[PDB]
Design a protein around this nucleic acid. Sequence first.
RNA 1: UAUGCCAGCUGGUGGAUUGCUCGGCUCAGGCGCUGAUGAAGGACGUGCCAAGCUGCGAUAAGCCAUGGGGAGCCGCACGGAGGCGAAGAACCAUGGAUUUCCGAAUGAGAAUCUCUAACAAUUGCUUCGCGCAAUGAGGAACCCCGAGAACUGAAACAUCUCAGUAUCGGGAGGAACAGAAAACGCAAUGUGAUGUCGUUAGUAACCGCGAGUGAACGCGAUACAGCCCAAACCGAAGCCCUCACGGGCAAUGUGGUGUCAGGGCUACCUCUCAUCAGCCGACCGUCUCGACGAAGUCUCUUGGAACAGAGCGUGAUACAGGGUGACAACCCCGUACUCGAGACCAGUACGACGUGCGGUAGUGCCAGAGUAGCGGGGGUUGGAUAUCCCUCGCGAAUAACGCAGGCAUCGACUGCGAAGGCUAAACACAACCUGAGACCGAUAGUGAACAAGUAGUGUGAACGAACGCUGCAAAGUACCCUCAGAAGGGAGGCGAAAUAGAGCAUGAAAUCAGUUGGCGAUCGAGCGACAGGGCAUACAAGGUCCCUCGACGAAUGAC
RNA 2: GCAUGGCAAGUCUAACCGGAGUAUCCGGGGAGGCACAGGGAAACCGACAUGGCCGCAGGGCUUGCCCGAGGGCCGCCGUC
Lengths: 145, 119, 115, 246
Amino acid sequence: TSKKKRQRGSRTHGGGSHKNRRGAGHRGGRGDAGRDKHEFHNHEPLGKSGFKRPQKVQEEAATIDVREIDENVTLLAADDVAEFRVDVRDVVEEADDADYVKVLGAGQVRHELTLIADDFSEGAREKVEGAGGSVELTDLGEERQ
Amino acid sequence: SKQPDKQRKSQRRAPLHERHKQVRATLSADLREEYGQRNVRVNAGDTVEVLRGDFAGEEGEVINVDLDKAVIHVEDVTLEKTDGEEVPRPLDTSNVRVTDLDLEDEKREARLESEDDSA
Amino acid sequence: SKTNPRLSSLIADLKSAARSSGGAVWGDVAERLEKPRRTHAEVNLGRIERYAQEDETVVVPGKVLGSGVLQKDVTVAAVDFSGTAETKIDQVGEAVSLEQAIENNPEGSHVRVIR
Amino acid sequence: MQATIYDLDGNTDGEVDLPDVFETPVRSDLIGKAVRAAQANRKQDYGSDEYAGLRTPAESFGSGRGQAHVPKLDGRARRVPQAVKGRSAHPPKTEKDRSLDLNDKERQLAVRSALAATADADLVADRGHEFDRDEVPVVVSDDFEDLVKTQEVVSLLEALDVHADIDRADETKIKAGQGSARGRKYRRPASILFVTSDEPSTAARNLAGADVATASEVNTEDLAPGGAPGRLTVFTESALAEVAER
RNA sequence: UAUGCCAGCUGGUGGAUUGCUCGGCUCAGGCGCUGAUGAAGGACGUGCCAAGCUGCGAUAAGCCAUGGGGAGCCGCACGGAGGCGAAGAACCAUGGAUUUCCGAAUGAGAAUCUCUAACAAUUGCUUCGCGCAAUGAGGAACCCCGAGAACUGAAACAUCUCAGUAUCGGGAGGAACAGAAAACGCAAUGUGAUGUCGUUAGUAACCGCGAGUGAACGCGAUACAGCCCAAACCGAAGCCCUCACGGGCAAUGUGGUGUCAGGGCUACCUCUCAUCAGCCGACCGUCUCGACGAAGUCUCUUGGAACAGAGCGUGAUACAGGGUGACAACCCCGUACUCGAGACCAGUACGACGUGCGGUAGUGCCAGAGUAGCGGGGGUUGGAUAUCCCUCGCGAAUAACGCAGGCAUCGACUGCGAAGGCUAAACACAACCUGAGACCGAUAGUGAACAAGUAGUGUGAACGAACGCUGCAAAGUACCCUCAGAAGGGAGGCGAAAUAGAGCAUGAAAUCAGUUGGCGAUCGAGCGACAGGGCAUACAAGGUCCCUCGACGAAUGAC
RNA sequence: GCAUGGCAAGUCUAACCGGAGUAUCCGGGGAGGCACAGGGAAACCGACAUGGCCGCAGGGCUUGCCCGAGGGCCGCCGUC
Ligand SMILES: [Cl-]
Ligand SMILES: [Cl-]
Ligand SMILES: [Cl-]
Ligand SMILES: [Mg+2]
Ligand SMILES: [Mg+2]
Ligand SMILES: [Mg+2]
Ligand SMILES: [Mg+2]
Ligand SMILES: [Mg+2]
Ligand SMILES: [Mg+2]
Ligand SMILES: [Mg+2]
Ligand SMILES: [Mg+2]
Ligand SMILES: [Mg+2]
Ligand SMILES: [Mg+2]
Ligand SMILES: [Mg+2]
Ligand SMILES: [Mg+2]
Ligand SMILES: [Mg+2]
Ligand SMILES: [Mg+2]
Ligand code: NA
Ligand code: NA
Ligand code: NA
Ligand code: NA
Ligand code: NA
Ligand code: NA
Ligand code: NA
Ligand code: NA
Ligand code: NA
Ligand code: NA
Ligand code: NA
Ligand code: NA
Ligand code: NA
Ligand code: NA
Ligand code: NA
Ligand code: NA
Ligand code: NA
Ligand code: NA
Ligand code: NA
Ligand code: NA
Ligand code: NA
């Protein structure tokens, strides 16, 4: 049995005095009315802040952490093995509607990896080299100067 | 139309020529065998046997066939009015069986015999 | 008000074991399973790999998922495993149903709970 | 497990392996949810006329004549819900979504589970079906798909000691309630489901309570009418094989 | 024990309840214009007797033909009389005849009538004559083009919001509208007419930056289709009417060419399978309608009636639904199967006839002006400097030029040619046909299951109900007595039942008559709850209860 | 938010398409959504698959002593 199902007989259906459930007066006004007066509480303050750059001047980088690549190297049997070597662009999803692919350095790297991507972060390089690996910057990656 | 309302409606409002099918009766074993039909539209000439009413068992000649009320009058199947007069007790063809046919119509007889049409 | 007839029986079985046998984990797992699904365990391999040790059965009062890597040769017992989890685990150890665990070890001994 | 194939005489004729799915643990809760959805999803949207009871300029005299403030027209109350001929306060509405969603996985799992309850003679007996057989489902040679007369399927069924179920479904019930006025006067027990491979069995369909299906699209409802698992089924050599990958 | 209180019984009043559904409600598929050749609507007529409804129109519930259908029929409507039908009627389908007056209403006038040949009025053509034509008005909504609120929200209110809503003016179609880039701008080595659906996204954008408002490109789908002028260069090679003769149009340009795969011109190459015009002309599918269509009406019992119980038996590519004196696959209609017809798809697809596509080089020959663009003032939009539009003023280039790519100017880059035009299909609605339902079931559901937009109200605009059910069969009560009596009553008759007897199934409560039990004309008012006595009670569905004594015997606890 | 159920580093399809027993239903469709990294107005940069300590449940042991998921307190890391 639900709460609704038990209301018949209660007269007020849990609204308290029958003088309560009337119009918007019982809500302090329609919608967000009073968000600056009687009901300012818990509303983000009024005001303008910052600016936006035109949508078509924005670049969306497709990222991935080394931890993801690394945790699945063996499993990526359909990808180069050597002295492993993986082209990040072929790993990352959404790597199409993306302006470029970037490797981030979160997690560990327990293998020697040769990574090819459009960009890397300091941590990503340090980690990939520290595990006896190398990082190769794509041609698109030739945008560093 | 699987809907009861529509079924009863179409039966109560069917045009005159579509009412002939509401006054059909099963044929006797012989007649069925003779013409290759299970029933026929009872005609005011045929002889018939009552299989269900209070008059079940009795036999007689069809005296009248009302298409509108989809009912027939069979000779001697009657009621006693208060004044003593004797009036017919309307029967539904469904409770009746045709034992003899009045085939004075070339057309009726033709229909009966053909195997691509029923009378 | 549990809906799954299987989860329901498992729970009843776990109780029968904790009562008869000297088990305490089984009744413990039985109570956690009786609690709201949202509270049940959802553990990835990374966590099992971190706190498990060989010859000590890992007991998940929930479900095991396949994220992360498991190398230790452990026996993991859960209400269920994702398809991938059960695959990775069987490569280096053994994935077992709580129903089997209760059988091979009704005293629930040498077991480690992980959530 | 093993599946005893039968010929159109009811005599054993080899046997095939009962596919794995028939081992899927029977989950009546999931099956019930699959049937519930299929049954809701075919229900039609309805509801009263948007303006029923609003077609009037009735007004209230307000205070002054020892009368309640109820809209009236030609001295007759109208519009308001407490008034005879007035609108319906919270009526059935066409806009209401009367459909139920269901994850493909959850639904496919129910299909497999219902399939499996078919292989359990005890369940099948509990569901209510009448039969004197130990094996179930009843598998038959693909020649069954060539039968044409209902009567022939009757003999085969009597030979298979399964015809009793049709004797069960051979009784219609005239329901209580007004359904009758909307064309739902009758109802009857569900009997045998015949799963073939190329086309539903035209020869078995008219059998009392019988339902005909095909292996590629047989669903939860035919496998478990009303959400109750364990329907007395009869697959086809090839049907049985197709069902395997569902 | 008057007046009277409480409960019940018999009869009534009333019309709830239960059962029933010829009506509603909603969803879905199909289909879709009518009208000066006078529609839609209305008026008045029309029947043997005819008031209402339906039909019809002075040939008036109808006339003719062809096809279907069939022994009956003369609408709803069951009377009386009479008639029609084998000369094939009724009835159904298609086509035709008739089709009064008012009505766009059109000769003129007029509350449906009247006065003395009439396209009134406005237009096109024109034999300049109403000679040949057009328009007008209707339609359930849908559609397109204009005009455009307020309550309300913002807890007041002015911008904002309600909302480009309601409502008003004009108009099209079966669908409208849009539509082959002076586009997009995931900026690209990219996409490629237009609607619509899903999403993009409550994102970008607007906003007393408050409340609120709110896209697009793209993507996934649906369906797919692309062309014609103006001009250059030609220059009467042309078009319309008429059978013809003949007439009219047309150098202020008919017609040829041509239309960004730019074109024309000049010289060449190759070739046509593009396009455009015209001919033919469907399958399938879908919607509706129709033909044919299996198997019990066997036994016993109950019953007014078997469609019930028990027994025996049958069909099923048919166990949807309905009817029939009660629960019916096999009694009747139908239902599965197979088949036929019409409509839509569609004058479409396919096929074919004619035309001729395209490429090189040269050529500043051609290519839409109050335009592009700027300014003043407004409206509108998410459009912000960067929406779309109106109004007043100003105002360009000529492809070697111009516009766009979300502020302006200049250059580069990329895209694209405005100021001419047409265009199938996919999408909207629901009048009309058909189908469907966990919708309602007569105070419900439409206002309307009934005379329903009826009866009735208002000068008018407009407003607007209630009323469903005898019975299997009318067998709808003969005869007799009574009475002022075709009333009513008594007696009687029918039927299983008249307490089914006419607004007649069932027949609640409030309540009325008579009556039974209890109380009662010396007595006090929330009408009762719980205790306990009197009196009253057929059975059934409850069977307990009383006293002596004895056993057990908590707290408490004596003379 | 919560209860239940499926699947799980993923999950779900929408319109729509095919099939069919033709509004149900079977198959297909991942367009797109949310989740998988955050911080910053922006430019732009880009994180602990565990380093320490307490310690509940549970487990272990020679019965106080160990191991102690979750939880708690710190460290440390990304960015402004
Ligand atoms: Cl930004
Ligand atoms: Cl985890
Ligand atoms: Cl694009
Ligand atoms: Mg994608
Ligand atoms: Mg014949
Ligand atoms: Mg109403
Ligand atoms: Mg009832
Ligand atoms: Mg006139
Ligand atoms: Mg206000
Ligand atoms: Mg304010
Ligand atoms: Mg707006
Ligand atoms: Mg755009
Ligand atoms: Mg031309
Ligand atoms: Mg505005
Ligand atoms: Mg009504
Ligand atoms: Mg007045
Ligand atoms: Mg009565
Ligand atoms: Na409350
Ligand atoms: Na209230
Ligand atoms: Na408020
Ligand atoms: Na304030
Ligand atoms: Na009205
Ligand atoms: Na009053
Ligand atoms: Na709906
Ligand atoms: Na139509
Ligand atoms: Na009349
Ligand atoms: Na006429
Ligand atoms: Na005219
Ligand atoms: Na003229
Ligand atoms: Na206010
Ligand atoms: Na005010
Ligand atoms: Na504003
Ligand atoms: Na894209
Ligand atoms: Na009958
Ligand atoms: Na201006
Ligand atoms: Na552009
Ligand atoms: Na009524
Ligand atoms: Na996706």
